[PDB]
Amino acid sequence: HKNMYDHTEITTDSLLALLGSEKVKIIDVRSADAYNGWRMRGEVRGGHIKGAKSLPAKWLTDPEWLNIVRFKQIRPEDAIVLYGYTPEECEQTATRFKENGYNNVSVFHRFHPDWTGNDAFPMDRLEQYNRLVPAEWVNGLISGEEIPEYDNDTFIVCHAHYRNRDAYLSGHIPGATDMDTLALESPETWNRRTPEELKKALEEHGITASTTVVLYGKFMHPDNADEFPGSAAGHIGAIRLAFIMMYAGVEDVRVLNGGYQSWTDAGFAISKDDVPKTTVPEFGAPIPSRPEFAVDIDEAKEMLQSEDSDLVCVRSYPEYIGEVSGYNYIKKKGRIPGAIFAECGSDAYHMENYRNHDHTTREYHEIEDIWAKSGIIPKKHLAFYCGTGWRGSEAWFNALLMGWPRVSVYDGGWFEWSNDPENPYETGVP
């Protein structure tokens, strides 16, 4: 007897006995930040039931909901077990599955406090989840409230954009200041600036090595027909700047997960003030403190020859096979020989394969699993790259979050590689 609105409860003991079953899909309907590990109700152990997939209940208003589910490989013949902080949070999702041809749907009532509270019940979390912050954390920070995973006394919220102050002036997080990505990377090479330039730029924007910097950007629907589509890919830009700042030596860098969209979806107030900078006189550390995060072309060439190492191409497929360059300022088309392809998404200004529709990072197990199928694994020194390094930086950041011990960005990318006509390249379908 199928019942659309009254959902069978699954007990703790029954769920424990099913933890290894390939026919069971355990679905966490909490926010992706809680799933990653954030202790959003004060639970002592954060994260998810081991083996659970992420399907935030917020996504029920997405017209593509069923396609998300199918793309996650959750199928009608699976036994679906839903949980949240409360069973009541699962009710609408359970009904949505049942309305869409899933007849085996249960609700687990005792994730919190029973599962989270007992250390024999397996949980998992994104190892460095505290670098990828929810909007509630940022709001607590700017409010001076006590927040978890923070013991500094100095912070700055930084709104990234590429040559587009309107992205900030049209609406930003209260108190935040804007940073043009041109402040930290050069329009000549599209590589990070020299250490002396980085020092000066960081100081002028009010940033010391011991400042907690919270970076985010605004997605404004990049259109490849505009002169500068990157002016609209603000949150990729934010993660690119996070890379450069962490390389430079800012000890504590955070990224707002999903960027500006997450702030407004949470319903917080926004500001249009043009906030003046408060400069600081001394960065306070030698730049770069973390040079290993950045790989230039001679090291990249060595990595292509080493068994220990690989370059990871985070470009679109039409770029990879040489149909297009990806960019209106790159004429050469083709790919670096010997790199492992890890398709970014549709084009140079979209990261669909690394993100959810709401711009939060894609469920990290899915990224991990796809990467492993190509031999992109943490025991290697990996250098992520793309055309000029923005998408490479976002892939790199995803691997950093997983705790991977040797990940870098090959900054120069296809731009630098193809600018030397002596460098070999491939084209066409492999």
The answer to whether 177 is a known ligand-binding residue is no
Of 341-360, binders to ligand AVJ (CB under 6 A) are: 348-349
Q: What tokens were used for 342?
A: 């890890």
**To which H or E segment does residue 135 belong?**
helix 135-142
Q: Is 354 in the site for Cl ion (CB under 5 A)?
A: no
Provide the sign of the torsion angle of the four alpha carbons 82, 88, 91, 93, taken in this order.
negative
Binding mask 317-336 for ligand AVJ (x = CB under 6 A): ----------x---------
**DSSP conformational letter for 112:** I
- The CA distances from residue 11 to 14, 15, 105, 301, in Å, are 5, 6, 13, 55
Q: Work out how close the CB of 226 gets to Mg ion at its nearest, in angstroms, rounded to a whole number.
A: 21
Say if residue 411 carries a ligand binding annotation. yes
Cα separation, 74 vs 100, in Å, equals: 12
Non-local (6+) Cβ contacts of 245 within 8 A are: 184, 202, 207, 213, 215, 253
Is 361 annotated as contributing to ligand binding?
Answer: no
CA atoms of 352 and 341, how far apart (whole Å): 15
Residue with tokens 């923070």, as numbered in its chain: 150
By CB under 5 A, what part of segment 329-348 binds Cl ion? 335-336
Q: How far is the CB of 314 from Mg ion (least distance, A)?
A: 12
Query: Quick one: 243 or 260, whose CB is closer to Mg ion?
Result: 243
Quick check: 391 and 343 in contact, CB under 8 A?
no
162 binds, among Mg ion, ligand AVJ, Cl ion, none (CB under 5 to 8 A by kind): ligand AVJ
Catalytic status, residue 386: yes
Does 389 bind Mg ion (CB under 5 A)? Our answer is yes
Query: Which one among 38, 190, 293, 364 touches ligand AVJ, defined by CB under 6 A?
Result: 190
| Site residue total, Na ion (CB under 5 A) | 1
- Annotate each residue in 188-227 with x if it binds Mg ion (CB under 5 A) or - if it does not, as one string: --xx------------------------------------
Residue 279, annotated as binding a ligand: yes
When asked if residue 159 is in the footprint of Cl ion (CB under 5 A), the reply is: no
Q: Report whether 209 contacts 289 (CB < 8 A).
A: yes
Residue selected from 112, 172, 235, 240 as contacting Cl ion according to rule CB under 5 A: 235
Q: Is 219 in the site for Cl ion (CB under 5 A)?
A: yes
Is 93 one of the annotated binding-site residues?
no
Stretch that binds ligand AVJ, among 1-9, 134-142, 257-265, 388-396 (CB under 6 A): 388-396
CB closer to Na ion, 108 vs 320? 320
Using CB under 6 A as the binding rule, whether residue 236 contacts ligand AVJ is answered as: yes
Answer for which of 134, 217, 230, 259 binds ligand AVJ (CB under 6 A) is 230
Query: Of residues 80, 123, 141, 233, which one binds Cl ion by CB under 5 A?
Result: 233
Q: Residue 289 or 423: which CB sits closer to Cl ion?
A: 423
What residues from 141 to 170 belong to the interface with ligand AVJ (CB under 6 A)? 162
DSSP symbol at 428 = S
Q: Does 190 show up as a binding residue in the annotation?
A: yes
Task: Check: CB of residue 158 under 8 Å from CB of residue 201.
Answer: no
3-state secondary structure 78-90: CEEEEECCCHHHH
Q: Contact at 8 Å (CB) between 344 and 386?
A: yes
Residue 127 binds Mg ion, judged by CB under 5 A: no
What span, in angstroms and rounded, lies between the C-alpha atoms of 107 and 109?
A: 6
First-to-last alpha carbon distance for the chain, in angstroms, is: 52
* Cα–Cα distance for residue pair 413/294, rounded to 1 Å: 11
Residue ranges of the annotated binding site for Zn(2+) are 21, 24, 48, 124, 365
Q: Which positions are annotated as active-site residues?
A: 386
Residues forming the site for Mg ion (CB under 5 A): 124, 190-191, 388-389, 411
